[PDB]
Design a protein around this ligand. Structure first.
Ligand SMILES: [Cl-]
Ligand SMILES: [Cl-]
Ligand SMILES: [Cl-]
Ligand SMILES: [Cl-]
Ligand SMILES: [Cl-]
Ligand SMILES: [Zn+2]
Lengths: 150, 152
């Protein structure tokens, strides 16, 4: 019930979580393209990612990867250069490591759960987002930052 | 060949590469695919974009050789370069070269310029063979040579 309701809330907001392994690889590919400050259109960023993902993850599509990009967009990860032509995205300087990018990504899904009234604990979050229990403290610190400080 | 061997040696000596007519055609189309909308990519990311799509079709493709193809386009003044502080330089295809024909004209002209630098005299028929593997690009090659040789 809980997971189903979380992923519905994510999809309701134009976003997607592709499962722990696929999301991790999708994010590492976004990072590979943008960590040096390259400025890519959605077209080109998605082309870059889908092409490399599709062999291992056949569910990779322009639509599903676009939705992962939208999650990062909603999280304010990008500097956007607007045009008369397709707008460009760069990763903001503070988010050009996997740890940082993953922190904003994960925080955005927690905020979505808060927006939808879902009460999820660190252990549950670790399973949901990583398929393991090695990110409990990572998830606890995300939640603390979204609540009144001590 | 003598002229062919010498031409390609001259190109490679300048940090540039021509992958063969079929392969170079595909490589340039993939550069176009990444850059035709005005995206600004580092050499790193442009090479990655190209090799990831080229290598499955042409298994001899490497980051090193594709890097040399990008250098040929750079040498040919095809890019608008930007550089923010310490971050990597970014390449955009100049607006005038965002079609295959326009991009090939500048690429092909640069290779002709290299031939001239090296003192190689190659006729349009030979050029058509060299750059396209056919005899259907002789007039294209003549126009390129005339533009390099003769003021308009
Ligand atoms: Cl064309
Ligand atoms: Cl012709
Ligand atoms: Cl002809
Ligand atoms: Cl022509
Ligand atoms: Cl032509
Ligand atoms: Zn032509």
């Amino acid at each position: 019930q809980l997971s189903s309701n979380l992923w519905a809330a994510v999809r309701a907001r134009g976003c997607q979580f592709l499962g722990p392994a696929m999301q991790e690889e999708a994010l590492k590919l976004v990072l590979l393209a943008l960590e040096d400050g390259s400025a890519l259109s959605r077209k080109v960023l998605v082309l870059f990612v889908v092409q490399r993902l599709e062999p291992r993850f056949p569910q990779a599509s322009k639509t599903s990867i676009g939705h992962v990009v939208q999650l990062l967009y909603r999280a304010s990860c990008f500097k956007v250069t607007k045009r008369d032509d397709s707008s460009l995205m760069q990763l903001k300087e503070e988010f050009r490591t996997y740890e940082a990018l993953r922190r904003e990504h994960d925080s955005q899904i927690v905020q979505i759960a808060m927006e939808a009234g879902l009460r999820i604990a660190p252990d549950q979050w670790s399973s949901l987002l990583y398929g393991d229990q090695s990110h409990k403290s990572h998830m606890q610190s995300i939640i603390d930052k979204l609540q009144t400080p001590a």
